[PDB]
Point group: D4
Chain length 133, copies 8
């Protein structure tokens, strides 16, 4: 059911989605998705820093769709990605599977690449201190 | 360039995107996308009523990604569409070329169909009154 | 009694009122009315898209008055409807009996037609998906 | 055109509408109406005290529609009125003309009376002090 | 103890205070006072219409102090009053007693009159309708 | 005339009023008064720490009324001061002439002492650092 | 454990920290710190008036870091203090052990002195009135 | 002077501060600091993800102080750091120098380490796309 408050989701490239969910006033079992995305995928720019994500989550059947514009104070890749997929909380690990699309330019030549990402839940590690453990 | 205020975008199958753009407080040349989608395609669920849309827009090269959860007070199709794309405002007509992904079900069998919607800007039709024209 | 969350109300001519109720901070048993109206009557302007509605509701005896300005990103009929009425939730069906007034034009000749819409509550139709049903 | 900020409007029964106008984010040349209404009509209850009003104003052709639920901390008349009409700023005086409807109960017997009100603009009188002039 | 939500308070001149109380974040057993004041005192201007009041209420020993600037969309008396006094909820009636001060000008000649007002609680009268009872 | 931003006002007994002014949304030439009061009088409770102040100001003739509830995280004197007055910004010095009322206790014996504070504007003293001067 | 509402903390030199804690929307067991600091040390600038404080608090082991910019409507020392530390609520007394850094000037010669303040919680002193005690 | 909107600041360990500045209502030439901090310092935990920072910036002499509680959805190090230091925009590069303190526990044994960080401004790199340049 619920992963409410802040949740930490890590995909196959090291990439981190942190989701925040706020109930929608008009749309039943629908949450506004907010939070941050850290890109760590080897080929790409806009890696290692917080990009706000926006989208919508349908609780009923644990579906989601969210977007990142690859522009923040550290780096701009002049492009946008949208992720659309589903959750599966069953068992010892919780998994999100998504199909993604990415709008960009090569010349004055606009283009939409595409692909697929798989995120797994990982709960905050705890350390004695910043310095140790 | 500029769509400040609400703008009306109509796809090949007649479905309607109404966009509102709000500046991101932190993301250079990025706007939070809100507004409403009215799905008007022949063989489809959840048609002829407003679905909220949420996403993001990059004004640098006029790229967008938005999402709709198909649940409102009229009809629940327990599914999500994500659209990712770009706009060309050159010439007599402004067009939004999009690709899109749609996370839905059959049984216990999650799915994700792909597609392409192309939209054209259409400025409010004006009438003497609600009864004329 | 209670319509907490968004509710769907359909009139004789098929037009759709989606209501949201927020408690007044100061008015006993009064709610601020928001939501969306989709005008679906044969011989009319400004049909098949969401118009915002604003008004007020008295929960003591389940009375309402709301208004729509027929101007959105799709179509401007330069006019306003006001609806004033009451609800009966008794029995198998919940109905909203309304009278209404509509301020529009011809030439330089302001006008105000009268009328009566009657609405019935219809709870979200459910589908396996956006493609089925 | 503009009566922006707070405006004072007095009808034939002494009744006072104070309007506040805030531009709508989605609806072009449309304002959310807020403010207060003081009833001073001889036959009625809920006289002499502030009732919040809600509605919508279409600037284009200076049209309006607004609602009052006759419930506040001083008095409850368990009913609601909606006013729908037009402005005429021409000449030495500014005038609003409206058609109104009023939903109420007699027995378990719901009912909608009706009528018409005409409001004129009156700018704040100025006095040397509260005590004099 | 509590008169929370909206409360209706009537003094010896017919004058009406409606109070709204919101807990203070920093000041224990302290409420921000807001609401409306209707002046109906015979000698004065700024009579019969809503003036916002501002002040602070100390719950502990049911003490209060609030202010009205006699300027609104209907009338300006270019002056300000402050009321400071205490509650007594005991018995069949609830009473507020206050000492008031009023800052105004005669010539270029500034001046502070003074006086005392006594308010009694009066709960919303209820009527069959606006029209009757 | 103008005190936009925070201003510092010092009375004869050394107590400090720090004022912030916010335009009323509805009251011509009226500002909501916020800020902080530090009571510095010899023979008094609740001294040397910030008490919130709330009131209203009329910029037409530079008149004010504000209130302090003497309860904060340091000291509770279970009492309220109301100040009512006017400002003279003519000459080399800006002065705020005030009268005031103070609702406090003895036993089961509510009281309300009267008074007069006169304040002078004093613009931030500047230092090389927190350690110098 | 818990300091919900405003709390009063007094250091060895008599300076006063008034704390307010608000839950972070995203940071487990983290609170945004607001409130006011009154600097009461002998040989110092910017004393006896409220400086806003801002920082963060970790309730897991009751650790804090807050900052004051020494500029308000009374006195500008063009400098910043940062405090970093921990609380012990065991026993008859609650103490906040802190170290701190202070970024100030001489000429064109930026500096940063180090230090240690230790605070003790002191619950509001109560008085019959502002005049007694 | 100004680095207003979102700014990107990189220290000697790879660590990234993104600052957002909002003018303070009460404190002249003072900004509330907000934004995000990415830790990339070799010895430590809580590395590679967004931690909200809070503090205050004094424009006058370009001074700053801000805090991070090392707790977010990815990782908790149960500790807090405060940074206090100054800017120097002169020349071809803009530099921030800071003294930092860090509160943590070893056993039931609380402790405050300390150190110094130097951040340099780095403006958003621009890339043809996420995929290339």
């Amino acid at each position: 059911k619920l992963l409410a408050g802040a949740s930490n989701w890590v995909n196959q490239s090291g990439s981190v989605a942190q989701f925040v969910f706020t109930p929608s006033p008009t749309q039943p079992q629908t949450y506004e998705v907010s939070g941050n995305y850290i890109n760590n995928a080897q080929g790409t720019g806009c890696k290692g820093t917080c990009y706000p994500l926006s989208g919508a989550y349908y609780s009923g059947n644990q579906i989601i769709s969210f977007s990142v514009v690859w522009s923040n104070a550290s780096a701009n890749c002049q492009s946008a990605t949208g992720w659309t997929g589903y959750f599966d909380f069953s068992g010892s690990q919780a998994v999100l599977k998504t199909d993604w699309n990415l709008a960009f330019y090569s010349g004055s030549t606009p283009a939409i690449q595409q692909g697929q990402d798989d995120f797994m839940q990982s709960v905050a590690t705890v350390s004695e201190s910043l310095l140790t453990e």
